[PDB]
Design a protein around this ligand. Structure first.
Ligand SMILES: CCCC/C=C/C(=O)N[C@@H](Cc1cc(F)cc(F)c1)C(=O)N[C@H]1COC(=O)[C@@H]2C[C@@H](C)CN2C(=O)C(C)NC(=O)[C@@H]2CCCCN2C(=O)[C@@H]2CCCN2C1=O
Ligand SMILES: CCCC/C=C/C(=O)N[C@@H](Cc1cc(F)cc(F)c1)C(=O)N[C@H]1COC(=O)[C@@H]2C[C@@H](C)CN2C(=O)C(C)NC(=O)[C@@H]2CCCCN2C(=O)[C@@H]2CCCN2C1=O
Ligand SMILES: CCCC/C=C/C(=O)N[C@@H](Cc1cc(F)cc(F)c1)C(=O)N[C@H]1COC(=O)[C@@H]2C[C@@H](C)CN2C(=O)C(C)NC(=O)[C@@H]2CCCCN2C(=O)[C@@H]2CCCN2C1=O
Ligand SMILES: CCCC/C=C/C(=O)N[C@@H](Cc1cc(F)cc(F)c1)C(=O)N[C@H]1COC(=O)[C@@H]2C[C@@H](C)CN2C(=O)[C@@H](C)NC(=O)[C@@H]2CCCCN2C(=O)[C@@H]2CCCN2C1=O
Ligand SMILES: CCCC/C=C/C(=O)N[C@@H](Cc1cc(F)cc(F)c1)C(=O)N[C@H]1COC(=O)[C@@H]2C[C@@H](C)CN2C(=O)[C@@H](C)NC(=O)[C@@H]2CCCCN2C(=O)[C@@H]2CCCN2C1=O
Ligand SMILES: CCCC/C=C/C(=O)N[C@@H](Cc1cc(F)cc(F)c1)C(=O)N[C@H]1COC(=O)[C@@H]2C[C@@H](C)CN2C(=O)[C@@H](C)NC(=O)[C@@H]2CCCCN2C(=O)[C@@H]2CCCN2C1=O
Ligand SMILES: CCCC/C=C/C(=O)N[C@@H](Cc1cc(F)cc(F)c1)C(=O)N[C@H]1COC(=O)[C@H]2C[C@@H](C)CN2C(=O)[C@@H](C)NC(=O)[C@@H]2CCCCN2C(=O)[C@@H]2CCCN2C1=O
Lengths: 181, 188, 182, 181, 182, 183, 183, 180, 181
């Protein structure tokens, strides 16, 4: 499945030029790999930018926040380019790229919505899970407000249901800085 | 299952066959278009344009289609790189496969003589509350409209013709696809 | 299912002799057919005496419900509705369709209103057709609710956007029912 | 299924008054019951009407055509009332009621579309199946044209995809004669 | 599911009092047993009055069908056959087995004729036995079709090679039935 | 299952049993065997001078259930006529040919099949040897009975039951399984 | 499962055969297999278009479009492609066998060759089924024309002969025109 | 799979012209065996090839592919059964070069008729029946040649599963020697 | 599976010192590996012994016989040590080691019993399969008789049901020569 060039596998070759591929569902396993790569790249050289290409429908909130926190932590600027899709945690990591350096390819789809979950058990247990997810929504929304410049109450209205945006629409909304042609 | 080839070289080389073809700027797009496939193709397109933007890239396609967004990722990458991207369909290019075929640089889109090409409308699914279904319907109709506009540009056909011709599964011969504008030449 | 006694009825049939219909569980085509048959039979037998429709239902098929709704309005007899336990979705719709002044809830009944649920699969065109259909279904039901409750249509839309659980007292205040019976 | 006092089950009591219930999916089993009932009622008295109440999403084309052919066979007029839903073969049977005696309750849903099927195997086998279903579409559409007064080419455009109609829309179109309030 | 009519008969039993037999759905051993019992009972009761066999069937077991076929020919009474909806495979075979001059189709009936279907697994010898058996079955059924229709045997072989759908009128023309009844 | 009126109301099979007809249809199981046996016994008690009619449409089934029916047919004082309609295979054909001689019939298009017993064994070598001895004894017993019922010599019955052997009604009359084909 | 051979260089056995211009087409024809065969065909022609390519076939068939991709590639490359069937070449396997350069299509003496019509399925609305039927009939017609050209048989003979599964001996296939010699 | 000093053990045996045929005969196994036979003949047609067989059989056509390849190569192909050679396994055993077909003393050899299945219309079943009968006839003729037995004996003896001892198989003509 | 330093995997290192590990179920695949190893080691040097460590619950009769026949074929003496368990074909291969050189670790379990099998179908087919498995039992029992010095009829009585032995019991019986402490 994965070609080699002269000897690196193609993804490792891209990493030599400070490119990280974030593809598919955001899981603990993917997060661990992205994080290792971000750390390695910042140790090697904190003056040169990192490029994070994103094509993801989302996934684990916590796995995403681990990547998010690691992006903010490294000294180097992290540029983000969405290609294809950035939905849910994918769009959250897109908008976390260093401001001025968050891009979408012209036909990318960006989607924002509320966190999804489940709770089962006694009334008390369901209340604890409800509190937890609502706190998670509130924390992510505050971050979105800061990343976009939109006020908090606008982010709440706009994430109530699945909200699909064009690359241009996302630029207008504040999620990205430029559409690259 | 995947054979390897050796190169008698003065610096000291064993490639798997697909990697040997990539040395000569050929990319194989085979099977269903998924996020994993898209990622590989995109990496390969980027790597080849970095290495040399003056020399063409050759994208061989045999695919029944797949993810619209994965496809659009590849489409946008083809247009991004400085190098011309030639496209050859062998066997089948259906749905997103045919869309990528016709996205090759104009004048350099080919079909092997017995290739099947098919175009249709996007497929999807939605479940839930009326409002959730309305959102999904809007989204897929916007996706149809965007892909149709690009097809109009890529083929020269007017938009309203593209709409009538993608309403149902539309199979074409390599010759029919040349006539229609999807490709430039049938190669013997 | 117990029997009572010289004629011998099953208990539900004995209640039907006194003009009581039990609507229990999911609203399906089979249940609708039975309810409708019972409504018709009771009206033929005597249109001057009221019919009592007891409801404990989480909902079900919109069209099966509408069949029952239309039948309730068709028969000359007044149809009183009492909710016991639950009336959700098409259940609450049928509750509020009872003759005005004769729609009741037992004190600890749960009433719920929301939007129709569905699914669509296939080509963009097919999805559009299904979307139009379910939105038209939402609109037609919401207009009927507006009439039944006295609430304006736009209030009904905001209030059915998500699952909206109500107390018997809250439902009386909202106009779904007329009285809470102790 | 409740009983009423001779002691009848409720559906059998309605049959004494010449009402037949067609509910749920049109299968061979359902068709056989409806057909038996239709035949019985016509034998018993051909001067008095039969009332066919329909709530059905459709089903077998051939099982439907068995009912259709029987409705036309019996001397007695067959009135049809849709309550809830008449889709596909359900709507076809609705419109087959005697003209002037086809009704809908006010909130009935009526749907018309083209026949559905499948075929598997050799090219020859697929061709035979394709010819068969196309001939079935053509026959049904001709009958619909007659039943509605619409011209054949209108019926073809209008059954191309799922076509949902209001009771009022169906009266306008010719499927039914009256909406009963 | 099955209504009753007033002595109190279930609807199928009431039709049997007037010498009508309903053959509906798949032809199985169970169905064959019922049809056969009914045919025998009716002939014992009165051999001078006709029997009416309504058919709506996609076919089924060859041997179950042959049991019904042999019984139809055995009884002294004429057996009229009417197809309504579908008579495919063994269904169409039993349709055409009705007494000549009294085999009917309703106008929109579908009739289908084809070859027998089967399977065999095992040693070469076992597969040869099974092949010989189903070919002999085909040949015996085709001979009887030839006789019932007036078509020569080699025409019946060409025409049953693949699924062959016929209109009521086409089936009249071919000899399978005598009249289309309006 | 339809019902018929005489005012007495029988289910159709029970009406046939009033006239001494027993239906053996489908697979021969312990449950079916129990019903057939009860009916045979009842009919003989009621009157041993009048014949019993056993209609058979069966692909076979349990050897021991079949043998229960066979033994009961021979036990009862009344003659048991057998008519095959459709199919009589394996134990079905064995019961067909067990009818009283001179009164075994086939409808003209009936299929009759004879073969060897089928079985299975799993476990230790000793356990499989036990099972093999048992099924071979079963084959030998049934073949002896078939030889007597048909008039064929044992060695012919062995060659002819080695594999599935389908017969026409006429072929089964020629072979000795039945007495007449009834038109 | 797959042994290796030494020459200071170590090849897996299939790769060693590819060094001598032999391609193995084994098992079902899928998009994955087609992609591998095609890569190999192109690589070998680039490396030297004057020396022949040897395509060994043991396949029951598979995807029509995957097969056509291999077919079109065989015709594209400058080098002659010899084809040898060993064991089986059925459906798309026999199509590829007969696509080898004329004069250089072989069968091992006990090879089985089978030709038939394309297989498929269609589900949905009448319109959708008509589209699918048209497509598969066009596919049959295209393949049959090619077979006519490759064998010398007239088109109407190819249509009668592919109506049902048609198994041929190596000698029968030589007689029919699908191959040139039995080796 | 252990290594020796660096070959994997099967590859080390192939350096000495030994091919292992183990387990079910499938298209994948046949492909590997065939590649190995071809490679060994190209490398040297004067030195023998040794095919060790432990197999319950499998695909008739896969087997015939191997059979035809054994006869094609110029080198003599010796066959040794160890454990089992049933159905196509026994057919390949007896295809080794005459005088060089062996069994280890406790080997089981079994011959029978081909197995198959058909489903569908009477015509389709007839086609399948003709095909499997032709396959039986072809394999039986080859067995007759390979063993020296007359065709009619091969037909009676393959009617049902027929298990043979290494000594019984030598007496019958399937192999030449039992090796101790 | 660890490696040790040339760099061998641990099993390959043991094979350099003429040790073969027979572990788990005896299958065609396992047999093929063992056989290849036995052959390789005899070609390399027929004067030095081979050591076959056994921990196996048994498996395929024919696979086991393949290993048995190979052990007898090779010029080199094959020592056998059971560790843990040698049941069914495992114990058969244990006792096939060169006499005087068959060992058990003190707490090894040895088990002998009869062959297991199955047959389905016609009486004739079952008789064939019964004859075959009885001939297999007789052939194995004869070899056990020779290997242990017990008479055949004792072997038959003693393999009739599962027969578990201690290392000491197995020495007494003749299956092995020594218990090694
Ligand atoms: C226990 C035995 C009687 C069971 C009751 C059936 C009944 O009331 N059907 C409703 C129609 C209906 C069906 C449905 F499924 C749901 C629904 F909401 C309404 C009905 O028509 N009631 C009539 C009396 O019945 C009839 O006239 C007849 C005879 C009866 C055996 C069944 N007719 C009907 O189905 C039809 C077709 N009704 C009519 O023809 C008349 C004429 C104009 C159309 C409507 N009709 C009426 O409304 C009559 C006139 C006076 C009031 N008026 C009923 O109550
Ligand atoms: C509604 C009434 C129907 C009940 C009839 C049952 C019946 O006919 N049983 C068979 C035995 C039998 C059972 C079976 F499961 C299978 C089978 F092939 C045969 C029977 O024995 N019939 C006798 C007359 O009936 C009896 O003597 C009684 C009384 C009855 C209530 C049931 N006896 C029996 O079960 C037994 C054990 N029969 C006997 O004990 C007598 C005495 C000597 C031993 C056997 N018997 C007979 O054979 C009698 C004398 C000669 C003929 N002879 C019957 O027909
Ligand atoms: C291990 C490395 C070898 C890779 C081999 C690639 C190759 O041979 N492609 C085929 C086209 C093809 C693709 C496919 F997917 C299936 C198939 F059957 C055929 C090809 O066109 N070969 C050319 C010569 O090679 C090329 O010109 C190049 C350069 C190379 C890096 C890959 N070019 C191509 O892919 C294409 C598209 N070929 C061309 O662009 C030329 C120019 C005009 C359009 C078509 N071309 C040809 O037909 C050339 C000219 C004469 C014949 N003519 C080849 O044989
Ligand atoms: C062996 C190494 C192979 C790596 C090649 C990567 C490459 O070409 N990325 C595309 C961006 C892209 C990403 C993607 F995921 C999909 C896609 F279609 C396109 C790219 O930007 N190419 C640049 C040249 O490279 C860059 O400037 C860098 C450095 C490189 C290690 C990766 N940069 C980027 O990812 C970004 C963000 N590009 C830029 O920073 C510049 C500055 C302004 C924004 C966009 N840029 C360009 O377009 C540059 C300027 C001129 C054209 N222009 C490229 O071709
Ligand atoms: C409501 C009660 C129904 C009772 C009738 C059943 C019946 O009609 N059986 C068919 C035979 C038959 C069985 C079957 F499973 C399928 C089938 F197509 C046909 C029958 O034989 N009818 C006879 C009259 O009935 C009988 O003679 C008797 C007595 C009765 C209790 C049942 N007999 C039979 O089963 C048999 C074996 N028939 C005969 O014994 C006579 C004598 C020679 C053989 C054939 N027989 C006749 O054909 C008789 C003589 C005159 C015409 N002739 C019937 O109609
Ligand atoms: C790592 C490389 C070493 C590979 C070793 C293989 C080996 O030892 N095979 C056994 C045969 C055998 C196969 C099997 F699958 C199971 C089994 F128990 C035994 C073998 O034959 N050993 C011979 C020496 O080897 C050979 O002569 C050759 C050449 C070698 C590459 C493989 N020959 C064989 O397979 C055959 C067929 N053996 C012979 O031809 C000779 C001639 C008469 C028949 C048996 N032969 C021998 O026994 C030779 C003669 C002296 C003793 N004598 C071995 O030890
Ligand atoms: C080629 C090797 C690549 C390894 C890259 C490691 C790295 O970048 N660690 C992050 C911490 C971190 C961990 C994590 F799991 C996620 C995440 F987002 C961030 C880091 O803090 N780097 C330091 C550099 O100095 C270190 O101590 C590094 C060296 C490395 C071998 C491991 N240290 C650490 O684990 C941590 C935890 N660093 C510290 O604890 C220091 C001491 C006080 C607390 C915070 N620290 C720093 O902030 C140091 C000093 C100033 C900035 N400051 C780094 O960048």
């Amino acid at each position: 499945l994965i070609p080699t060039v002269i000897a690196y596998d193609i993804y490792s070759r891209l990493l030599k030029d400070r490119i990280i591929m974030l593809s598919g569902q955001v899981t603990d396993d993917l997060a661990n790999s992205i994080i290792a790569q971000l750390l390695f790249l910042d140790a090697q050289d904190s003056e040169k930018d990192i490029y994070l290409y994103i094509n993801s429908p989302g996934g684990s909130v916590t796995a995403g926040m681990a990547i998010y926190d690691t992006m903010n932590f490294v000294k180097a600027d992290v540029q983000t380019i969405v290609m294809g899709m950035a939905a849910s945690m994918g769009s959250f990591l897109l908008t976390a790229g260093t401001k001025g350096k968050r891009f979408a390819l012209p036909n990318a789809e960006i989607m924002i919505h509320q966190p999804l979950g489940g709770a089962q058990g006694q009334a008390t247990e369901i209340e604890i899970a409800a509190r937890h997810i609502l706190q998670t929504r509130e924390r992510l929304n505050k971050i979105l407000a800061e990343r976009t410049g939109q006020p908090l109450e606008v982010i709440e209205k706009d994430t109530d249901r699945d909200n699909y945006m064009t690359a241009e629409q996302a630029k207008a909304y504040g999620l990205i800085d430029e559409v690259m042609e």
